[model samples]
Target chain A: GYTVAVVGATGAVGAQMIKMLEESTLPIDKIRYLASARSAGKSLKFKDQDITIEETTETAFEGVDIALFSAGSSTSAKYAPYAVKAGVVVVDNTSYFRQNPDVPLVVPEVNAHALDAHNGIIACPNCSTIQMMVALEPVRQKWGLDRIIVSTYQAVSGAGMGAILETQRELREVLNDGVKPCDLHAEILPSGGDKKHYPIAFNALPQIDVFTDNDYTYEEMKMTKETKKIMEDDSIAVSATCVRIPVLSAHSESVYIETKEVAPIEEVKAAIAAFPGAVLEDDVAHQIYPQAINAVGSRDTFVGRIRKDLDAEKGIHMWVVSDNLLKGAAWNSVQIAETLHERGLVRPTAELKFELKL
Target chain B: GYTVAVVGATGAVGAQMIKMLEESTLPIDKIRYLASARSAGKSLKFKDQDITIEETTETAFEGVDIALFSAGSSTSAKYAPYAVKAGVVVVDNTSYFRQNPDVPLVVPEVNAHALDAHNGIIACPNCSTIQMMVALEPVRQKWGLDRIIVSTYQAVSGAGMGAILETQRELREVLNDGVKPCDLHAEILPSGGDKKHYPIAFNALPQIDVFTDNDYTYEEMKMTKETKKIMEDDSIAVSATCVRIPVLSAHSESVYIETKEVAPIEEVKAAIAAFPGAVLEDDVAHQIYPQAINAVGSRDTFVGRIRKDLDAEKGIHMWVVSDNLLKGAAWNSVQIAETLHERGLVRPTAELKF
Candidate 1:
């Protein structure tokens, strides 16, 4: 039995992390909720008991055996080393330590073996990158991948809970008050940290995150950089154009890949269907394919619309959809925790590999 | 001066056709509005004049020098041959004649030269194909294209005017009535011609038209076949995955192409800016890329977000947007008509070789 702590327990993904923990397969003896000062005394129910939230601090991880961190990157950067020092294995859901050499980025189905090298922290990939890895891992294992070009149609929930509210408000302004889309006001989307914001209701904004020096958004670059590190392959070429659409939940991706060998469409479908945590809904004859609205609450990644590229013999195209908060953040973190427990890799190390900067 | 007829004058694209003719460069002495029997006596304004709609039949082409047919594919299939026999050069907006061996599928910016061999009937390419042609013509001419892979974020208006109404209604249902998107009912999309319909409010449907034998929708195939015909290149490999989004007017496409030569991104932007009817809006530093909401009511195709592939040196990516009703249909048809007049190809052909 393990004493589990959930950091940022009241946030959008943090609340989902709590729910996933409630339904998780790992053995748990006690549950602890931790948040910032404002949400410290709040009560959140786990199973039939109410758990009181505590302020996250260096000494707060005293008896915790496993800590799942969904707080912002700054919070993770500040407290993760402390949790690791307290002999608690941490599964971080932020982008803070994903590229750290000592931390392993683990998607249980794709690169669970990457967890064998974790010192004390395991990082979850971005929501968009998480689903693509789940959908493509089966194909990559069968016929080696060479190149990938992806364009994302992501939902507002990936931004935060406030983004969901903003999207609904904008839709009401357009539908109830007869406000045009261009006239609608926005403050949280395209990217909250970017210089400008754009309306996502009845429109598609091609910019997802703040622009990098190479003109690709940070979200787009994350997809490129994280795939290489997680796949353990530096040879695979990748490019992405991440766009924000009006969907309230579930990110959809239009993925094109060139494989080393020509994989038949039926065999590819079979491979995806046989992969754990991947649901194949591809039946064009019956007009069956994955839709964002249908994948709202599921932790499973839905993949469909599989077909061969007309020009290239080894090229393939597919559509991948999943709940951004769950499979993208919370559930993935929980899944990594479960895999660590199953492998008996959840104990603290003798010496900490990460240094506390402060 | 010429007498022109606007068939299906009461419909969506027909109304845009009338509006395009009002602002057209082609000399028009008079305009005739023709539709089905239900709208036969309905009066529609062409410029300041109230033109009464007449029933479209074999005799409706009597004395009209040019006819713009947009009623439907079946309507064009029946009336287009009769209009040609009446010495009227027809610009059909339906898919009926677009692949006809005797007809030329024309996008004036890309292939006005294909019109020199037109046999009285010039077929306008599909709306999705039309904008792609306008955006890629400059690139193909400068660097030479070898392959293209496009995924579209098409608007509901491309389906029909009723589709636009249905999209708004579905949004109202979801917003005001608090109905779940999956629980909402639909009848006009993903396609009216297909057996099933899905909501287009906040959802994305990958199936555009009915699934063909190869699992590619008819709409997707149109982009493939029409691009080859309009660009006059059979060796160019093209594939499309057309999806319908909730946008009302303009259609946005995420287009990827591999050119024969490695074209510099700056030179590509310069060429597209210098090309006619194509606007370059690709300044990411200022957050100035082509957007669907900003492209409504414009005939010019907007191209932006242009970049080179990180691995493939010859590959380039861009986003193309245009009013599905304008450059996609009515404006492209009218532009073709203007080109025909400029080339002195508008006159009735000798014995109507078309």
Candidate 2:
């Protein structure tokens, strides 16, 4: 039995949080859903009980045992500390505290030991990084670590349901009415803060997040930095190109990696299947591979087409796909809460030491 | 002005062929639209006239001076010779005649000179290859290309209307009805002949065309082999990973290239703009870059985001985009015709060469 709170409970990922909780094995107890003022009062059902969503505040977490936050970075930045102060264990799904040294960026299967270092805050890695890690961790452990080059085929829901609806509507118009994208109605896509917003329907946007000083996008930088953090190895060379494709739910990646030691393709497959939360769908003879549509609603990180590089000795390539909103954000956040509850690690904290190269 | 026939005029690239003839600068005295028995007796429009489409037969090429063929490989393989026998100048848009030795695979900008040698049938490169050659020819001529690595984000329209419509329907169900794709209906995606088909509405299909001997898609292999044939350089090491995205028209590529000599970024930009059928739209400060949306309906290939690879020597990378149905197919075919007329190279051949 426990008291729980959900933040960003109105967003795409937050919706999954509510759904996952309904089917969770956790004991029934008091439930509290927190959102911004605009979304407050929205009702969601959990185990047939209608939960009234409330506005997030300083005291919202007073009696909560597990607080799941999926609001934007700034909202989590301000309220996450307050949640800890109110004696609530917080699992933040935003990028607000991902690089924070004190908060464990835990992929429960990859490195759950990092969970012990947490001071009531657990960080979920970026969606693209989460799936790649699920595929690469086994190979990394077996063959040793080196560099990774990945190009992602990301879904519009990674932005939000608004972006998803925007793409769908725009694409339909382009196909049915022959309406130019410029002639269609568009509100959100390719990030809301960018200078010019364009329809992502029937197109590929090379830019995912706003550009950093080095010309790389914030999305690309997140993949690079988050991979290093989650692996706890800054020396590992990682490069990423985060592309916004027209997909709606699952994020697919064409991942290329160079191993430090040579390993056979079958071994890589077995290693991945043996890893926690990882599912191997690779069987070239049957033409079976991981696809975005198949990974849309589940929590598993699916891997397929595992094969060695045609040219390099230790090089390998594969396709990795997962439900970005689920495993990438909400489910990962909730999993952190579940891990804490399982390990008897949920309690109030005094202060957190958050220092990383964010 | 002469009589022209558009065979295979009801398919994917066939529809584009009809559209281009409507917008062509060349004058037409008469037009005949021909397709297989499946779409025979249908009517299509040309400007204001409704031209009744007919089934292709031996007599269909009678009095036909220019013929454009975009039917599937098998159809083109069977009927291309019959059109050539009737002295029609065929600009074949299928891959059937590409490696036929005598049949020239021409990108009008790069090698219009090959048109004169084309006796009856002239081949068009694959859609993915067509856009790349148009965007990269300037760099190749100036810096001397050593290697090329391209990964394409292709449109569903390239596969035809069936795949495009299927993707739309599948995506709607995924978002609205919560229908899992394995449970959804799929007929033509990844490849029609492939054992299983997946929903592509909000997904990326890494495999385009079918699997070749190396496990890479034929779509990917076409880019590598066709580049060498068109450029006439076997020494060039080129690779590709052709992926079908949810896009409907333009195909965008993330191209990484290595040149024999070091070419500065400014010089590269200048060269791209200086070339025919290519434009430079790189300006990240204003967030202006080449995109599939901007290239729609345009015949020109757009190149942008020109930068040197920081980790490699003599490496330059850029994003290239173009409307696949336009410059990649229709406009390129029309341009081939335009070149023949402009250069007075349109003449009948004495014999059908290989």
Candidate 3:
């Protein structure tokens, strides 16, 4: 039996992590819920047992065997080192440690072998990249991949619970209160940390995170950067255009890939259906395809609209959708923890290999 | 002054055509409103005059000089030939004759030269194709184009007025009446003529028009086939995925193109800004990109988010938006009429030159 702690237990993804923990197959002797000071005295449930929340601090992870961090990058950066030094194996759900050469970015389905090399922290890939890796890894294993171009129709929930509430409130104002979409007040969309905010109620925002020096938003570049790291290939070409739409739960993508070999469509669909954690929902004749509304509350990634590109012989296009909070964040983190447990890799290393910095 | 007639005068695009004609530069002496027998006795306002709707028939084009058809494919297939035989040059807004080699598919800005060879009937390109052509023609003229891949976030009104109403009703049911989106009843979209329907309120429907033999929707193929015909370049590789979103009026596209030459981003933006019907709204530093909600009721096609592809040097990505009813259908059709009048090609041609 192992003791586990869930940080940021009051957040959207944190709440989902608790739900996943209840159903998780990982052996649990006791559970700990950790959030900020404001939520310290509150209580959350695990199965039928009520667990009190604790403030996340350096001493909070003293006796835990494994700690799942989902608060944010800053929270993970500040306290992850303390948890790791206390001999706790950390499965982080933030971008802070993903690019670190020492921390293995694991998707479990694609790169579970990468987990063997983890020193102390196993980083989860971005929400958008996790689903694409699951959908394309099967194809890449069959036939090689050379290039990728993806355009995302992301939901507001990917931003946070506040963005979801803001999206619903914006929609209500537009549909019921007669306020124009452009005239609606916005303080948390496109990117909360960016300069300007745009209404995501009845509009499509092209920018997701703040723009980097290369003119691509951080969110778009995250997809490009995280793909190569997880695939263990630096030669694959990747580009992305991430847009926020009005869908409330699931994130959908229009993905175009150029494989190194000519892969038949039926064989590709069969491969995806056969892959674990992936469900094939493609039947054009019957109007069957993966949709956002139908993908909510599911842990599996749904992929469909598989067809060969009309021009390029090696090009294929597909639509991949999944609950951004589940497969994208919570379930992926929890699944990685289970993989660590099953492989007898849950014990911490003799010493931390990476330096912790603010 | 010339006499002009509007078929399907009570339709969604027909209403916009009336508005465009009222503000058109073409001199008009009188206007004729024509529709089916159900709407023939109704009255429509043209400027300050109350015009009585007349039933569309073989004799309906008796003294009319030009007839703009917007009813549907069946309506245009049956009556456009009658109007053309009466020597009333027809500008059709349906897909009936767009592929006919004898008919000119004109966007006025992209290929008004195709009008010189018109056989008394000129066809308007599909709504999605028109905006793409307008945005790309200036770039193509300077740097040339090799391939294009587009994914659309289209509006409900492109399906018609009932689709717009249905989208609003579905939203109201979801927000006001607490009905789930998957449970809402739908009839008019993703395509009214398709076998199954899906909700477009707070949802995205990837199928537009019915599925053709190749599994691509008719709307998607229209973009491919129509771009080649309009550009007079059958060798350009084009593919499209058309999806209907919950927007009411404007259609937005995320367009990717590989130009024949390596055109600089600043130069491409300048060329689109200098084009006739395209408005450059790209200033990412200020979060200024073309959006569907900001593009409603405008005749200009908005282009933004111009940037170079990170890997492919010749590939450029942009966002294109326009009023599907205005530039996509009504405004483009009326602009062709103005060009026809400007070129002194309005009179009955000599034996209708091919």
Candidate 1 Cα deviation (angstroms), residue B263? 0.7
Worst 10 residues of 2 chain B by lDDT: B308-317
What is the iRMS for every candidate structure?
1.1, 2.4, 1.3
TM-score of each prediction? 0.98, 0.87, 0.98
lDDT string for model 3 (A1-358, tens) is 8999998899678888888888899999989999999998899888999999999988888889999997888889988888898899999999999999989999999999999977889998999999999999999999989999888888888899889889889888987888988798889998999888888876878889888777688998999999999999998999898888888888888889999999999999999999999999988888888888788889999998888888999989888989998999999999999999988899977877766664
iRMSD, model 2, in Å: 2.4
- The DockQ-based order of candidates, best leading, equals 1, 3, 2
Residue B69 error, candidate 2, Å: 1.6
True-structure RMSD, every candidate: 1.2, 3.9, 1.5
Residue A198 in candidate 2 has what lDDT? 73
| Each model's DockQ score | 0.74, 0.42, 0.66
Candidate topping DockQ? 1
Candidate 1: deviation at residue A225, Å?
A: 1.3
Docking outcome class, model 1 = medium
Residue B157 displacement in candidate 1 (angstroms): 0.5
Instruction: Please tell me how candidate 2 rates in CAPRI terms.
Output: acceptable
Q: Candidate 1 chain A — worst ten consecutive residues by lDDT sum?
A: A9-18
Docking class of 3: medium
What is the RMSD of candidate 3? 1.5
